[PDB]
Write a protein that binds this DNA or RNA. Sequence first.
RNA 1: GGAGAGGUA
Lengths: 50, 1316
Amino acid sequence: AGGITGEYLMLTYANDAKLYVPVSSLHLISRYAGGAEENAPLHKLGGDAW
Amino acid sequence: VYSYTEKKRIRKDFGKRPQVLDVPYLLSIQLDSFQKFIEQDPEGQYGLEAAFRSVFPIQSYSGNSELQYVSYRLGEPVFDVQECQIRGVTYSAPLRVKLRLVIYEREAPEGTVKDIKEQEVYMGEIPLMTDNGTFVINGTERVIVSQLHRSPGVFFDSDKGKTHSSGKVLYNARIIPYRGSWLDFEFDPKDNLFVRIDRRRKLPATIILRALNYTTEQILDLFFEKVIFEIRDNKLQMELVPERLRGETASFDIEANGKVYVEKGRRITARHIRQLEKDDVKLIEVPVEYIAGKVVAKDYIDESTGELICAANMELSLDLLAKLSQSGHKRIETLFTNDLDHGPYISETLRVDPTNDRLSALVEIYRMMRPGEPPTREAAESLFENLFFSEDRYDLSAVGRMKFNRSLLREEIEGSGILSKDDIIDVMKKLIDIRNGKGEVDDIDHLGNRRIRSVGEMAENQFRVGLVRVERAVKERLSLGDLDTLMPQDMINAKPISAAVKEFFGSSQLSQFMDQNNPLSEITHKRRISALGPGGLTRERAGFEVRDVHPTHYGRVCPIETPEGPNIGLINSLSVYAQTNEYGFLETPYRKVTDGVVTDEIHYLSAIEEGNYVIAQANSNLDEEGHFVEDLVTCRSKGESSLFSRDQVDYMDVSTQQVVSVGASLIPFLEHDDANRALMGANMQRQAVPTLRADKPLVGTGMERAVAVDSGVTAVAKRGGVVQYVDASRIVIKVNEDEMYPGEAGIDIYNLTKYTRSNQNTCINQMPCVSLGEPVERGDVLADGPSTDLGELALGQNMRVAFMPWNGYNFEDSILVSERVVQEDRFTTIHIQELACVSRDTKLGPEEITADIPNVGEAALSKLDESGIVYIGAEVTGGDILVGKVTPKDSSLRVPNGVSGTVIDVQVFTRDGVEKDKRALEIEEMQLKQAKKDLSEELQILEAGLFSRIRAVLVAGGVEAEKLDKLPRDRWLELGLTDEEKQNQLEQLAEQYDELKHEFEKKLEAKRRKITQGDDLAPGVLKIVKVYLAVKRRIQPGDKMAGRHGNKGVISKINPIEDMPYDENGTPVDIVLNPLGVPSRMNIGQILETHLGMAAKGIGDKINAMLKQQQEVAKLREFIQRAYDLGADVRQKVDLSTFSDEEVMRLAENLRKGMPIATPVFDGAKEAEIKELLKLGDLPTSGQIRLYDGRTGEQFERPVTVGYMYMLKLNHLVDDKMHARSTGSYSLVTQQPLGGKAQFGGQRFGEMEVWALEAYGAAYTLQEMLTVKSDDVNGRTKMYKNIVDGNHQMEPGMPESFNVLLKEIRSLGINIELED
RNA sequence: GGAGAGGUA
Ligand SMILES: [Mg+2]
C-alpha cells in the first residue's frame, strides 16, 4: 500500500472486477440475504449507468 | 556432412579462411529491440514495465488516494497480418493493464485504507511487429529504421581556431541529457567561463554555481590551490610549495634558510626545485612587491571594530595590506595562478557576475529562462530545482550516466539519473583542466559517442510521451473529489496513448515505407542506420566531416553501401556481423588471441574498447596451430594500420567480410573494384526487379542462401519430416517421429502467398521447390519467393556477354541486346497495379456503380458485368472502363493512358448500412465457400494426421489390423487394447480430436462474422472498389539494366539473333557491352566475373554434353569430383563417395546449366584458380575467344572477351518514364500547366533553361515559351485555334502569372502599376 | 495544395 503491507479480502464482482477490503474493517461485510447462495446475482460494483 | 536439400545443387566455395562464426540472423537488431519492447520484464528495466514503473504510481494532489499498476497483457490481435494487409488497418494488439486504485481514509492520518479496487482496463492499440521485422500500419508495410544519434553524456569539444579572428581555440562542454534540458559551458576568447541552458542567452557559469547554495569563498576553495602568506616581524615569510615554481621566471633574490638559491634573471630550472626539495624548504622570505596584483581568497573583517577590510576575490594593494596587517591578521590566503597550468578563469567570471547572493542568481536564471514575468522568490527556486534536479523533468539514462562517469575518469557505472552538484563541479573542473593543457577533447564522429536508437526505444519514448498526458489527466480528475464510486476506466483515456503511438508508427520522420522490390532490398532496409530524425542532424545542414567515414567504422558500419546524392553517409548501413550493445553502442565481434595462438572464443568488442587493444587484419596468414607465420603482421592499434610484431596482438578479425554490409557482400570480386563504382553497384543491387523465372547467380559470394532465408520471402520448414502433399498453393509436411510433440501432435501446413502486390508494384509469389515424398530437415526452404532460386538469392539473369564495341550501338554506356533474351522470355516482369474507385457522398446525393453510363456503347460495356465491375480475368488495354460510375446531373474509373493488362482480382468493400450489390454478394459467397474449404480442408487433413497417429500407436499393444477398419475411423478407441498409459496416449489424442471438433465449429462461424461484416471506411464513402491489374512489361530500347559492379546502361537496341557476334561453335552472344567503361570506372571485378562465369558455363556445357549422350554415373562422379576439387587449398572439400547415386544424378541435372561458384568477398578466387578451372574445361585459358561477326561473317581480329555476366533489370522502366503533353488541364491560382505525370503535366522550362535561350539570339521561341505555351490564357486558346486553322501566328499578350505578382505586391502596402 | 521519406541523372 505504498510501503505498508496489508492483509485484504478479495471479493470478486461481475465482469471479474476484484475488490480488496481491509481485514480491520470487517464489519462492512455480510453474508447473502437473498437465499440464493448457489444462484446469487453479481453486481457491477461501480455501475453500468456510466 | 551435407543435408539432403543441399545435395540438390551444391555451390563450389572458394576461399581459404575457416569460418569461426556463422553469419547471424540478419534481422536480429529489429527483433531484439521489439522483444525488449513487448515482453514481461521482471527486473523492470526494459519495455512497457519500465515506462509504467516510471509513471505509476500516480498520487493525487490532495493525496487522499493514488493509482498504482500491477501488470500488463497484450490482447490477441483482432485480425492477423494478411487480413490487416488487405483491409487497410493496423496489425495491432490491445493493451490490457491491471490498474489498482486505493482509497485512503480522510480523518485517519496520512496512510490508512478505506478500500482498494482492481480491474483489467484497456488503453491504446499498439502495432505488433510481424514475423520478419515489418509493421503493417495501414496495409502499407513500414519499417522503423534505426537512428544513430548523440549518446547522452558530456562531450568536450573545440571549434578549431576558426572563430574570434584570433586563432585561439574555445573549448566547450555539453551536458546532454537523454530527456531534459541541455547544459553548455564555454570559454570566452578573453578566458571567461560562461554557461547557457538550452542554447538561450549566455550567462557566466558563476550564476548557476551560486544557485547551488554556494558562496565565493567556497568556490575559490573548490577551483584553486592555496598559497599561504604569513606576515611576521621580518618581511613576509611566505609559504611556497616548490612544485608551483616550475617553468617560471625569477623576479627577486630567491634566498631562503641563509642560502642564495635562485638569482633574479633565471628561469626556475629543474635543479633549483630539486635543491628546494632536498633542502626541504617550505617558507621563503619574499618582498612585498610579490603582491603587485594578487587576489585574496576569503572575506577578512576586523577583530575589534568588526568592519569589512577586504572582500573575497579582491586584488590586494599595499594600502590594503596595511589595513590587513593592522587588524591582527597573520594568515593571508591567496589563489595560486599560473600563465599555463593554473589559469584563474573563475575569478574574472565572479567579477563579471552581477550576483552576490543566491536569490540574485535565481532571479537572473528565472529572467533568462522566461523573459518578462516579474520574478518571485518561490518560482525561481522551483524553476531551477525542477530544471535539472527532479526525476520528472530531467533524465540521464543509464547510458547517459555511463558516458558521464567514463568521461570524467570516475569508477561507478551507475548513479543518480538526475544531475547532482558534484557532477557539475566535475564538468567545470575537467573543462578548465582541458583549457590548462592536460586531458583531451573528443571527436564527435567516433562511434563511442554515437548510439543506435532502435524501434523499441523510440516507440517506448513515444509511449511514455503519451503516458505523461494521461497521468496528468488522471491526476487532475483524481484530485477532483468524491472518488468513492469511481473505476479506472473513466480516469484513464486511451485516446492520448493511441494518438502518441499511432502518430509515430503512422507518420513519423523515421517510420518509412518499405522498399520491397527484392528480398535484398527489404533486408537491407530493415538494417539501415539513419542519422536523420529527431535528435539528429539534417540533409542540408550537414558538413563535410560527419558525412566522411571515421576509422572507427570498421566492422560496425559498412563503408561502401551508401545512397548517392544529397545524403552521403547519413544513411549508413550496418556491417554483417555487427551487433548493438547492451546500451546501444555498435559492437563488432573479434577472436581472442592468446600468447601466440589465435583461439576461437570471440568477444564482441565495443567502439571505445577497440582503441585500447590491438587487433589483427582479417587476412593474416595463420597455419594449423594458430601461429602467425610471419613476424611482421599488419594490425590496427588506434585508428592506424601498421606492421606490428607476431607477438603483440590482442584480437583477430572474425572474417574477411565483416567490414561490408549484407547488400554489398553479395558483390563477387569486390576486392578488385573501385569504391566509387562498388558503391554504385551495391546501391544499385537493391533495385533489381524480380524477373519472371528466377535464375541462380553463377558467381555468388555464399551469402545468397543467408539473404534468401533470413528475409521472410521463402517459406522455410519449421520441423523436418516428409512432405505429403505439394500443390501450387499449399505445403503439407508430415513431421518426423523425433520432432513430434506429445501434446498437439498433428502435422504442419504452409499456405503459399500467390500473386499479390509488393509494395512498389511488383509481384511476389512462392513456387514450391520440393516434389512429393522428400526428406526435409529443420531450417530448409520449401517455397521460393520472388527472385529466389532454391533458397539462395537470385536477383537477375546470367547471360553471355561479349566486351566488344559494336558499330556504335553501345556508345557511351549502352547495352546492345540480342533478341534471344526476350525470345527466351527471361527478363519480362510482372507488375501488379491497384486501381480504386470511390462511392462518394456529394450534393445531389450519392452516385451509383451501375452499368448504365451515358454516351457509351457496347464497346465500352462489353467487358463489364451487370453490376458495373469488369470480369475477373478480362484482359483490358488503355482507355477502357473497369468500374462504372456516374455524376448526378460520368465519373467512372478508367484504365490510365498507355498501360495494358489482365484484371486478376476485384475486392469490393462496403460501409455498414448500405446494401451490397449482386457482385458483392457473389464475391462474399465464394469467399465464404473458400474459407469453409480452407478450414474444413485443414480439419480433415489434420484428421488424417490424427488417425495416422492413432494407427501408428495401434501397431503394438492390441494389434488387430482388420478390426481397425471393421468400425470406421471415427471410433478407434473401443477396439481391443490394454488399458495402460498407451490408452492414456489414445485418450489424449481423442480429446485433441474433439478439441478440433470444437475449434472448427467456432472458427468457421467466427470467419463468417468477419466476412459478412461490412467494413469501416472513410466518413462519407459508401463502397470502395479496388481492381488489381497485372501487366507483363517485357523489355525494349530505353530500359535500364545493370550489372553487379555498377556498370549501369540503357539497353539501346533489341538486335536480331542473326546479326550478333557468334563464336566458332556458333552460339550467338546475348549482350554486347562496351569495353570502354572499364578502364575509367575501375570495375575489373566485372572482367574477372565474366571470366569466372565463362569457366562455370564451360563446366556446365561439359556436364550437359556428358548427360545428353547417355554416360554412366561413374564418369559424372569423377568429373564433378575433379570440378569440386582443384582449389589451391580451398575449404569446401565435398565428397561424392557418400552420394547415393540418385543424388549424383539429381545434382547433375541441376548443374546442367552451369556450376554455381562461390567467391567470398575478400578471400576471393585468385586468377590462378580461374586459369585452372578454365583449363579443366575445354576453353582457352586467356579467357578471350575468337568471335565472328553476324553480318560480315568475318573474324574480329584482336580476339575478344566473352563470358557469363550476371545482369539485373533495374526498376526504372522506360514505360514508367516516357511522357508527353500537348494541352491538358491547368493550375488554379496561376494559369500554368500542372506538373508531374499523374496529372497530365507538361515539363518545366526552368531558370537555367531560360538562360540558354537568352544566350542564343532566340527570342520569339522564348516569348511563346513563357507567354503563349504556358500562361497567356487569352493567347493559348487563340494559338490552338490558329494551329487547327493552319496559321502559325502568336498573340503574345501579357502572362496572367505576372498579374498574380501585381496583386501580391499591391496587396501589401505597396503601390505598383504599369505606365503609359 | 502543403509537409514527410525515398529514388534517378
Ligand atoms: Mg547521366
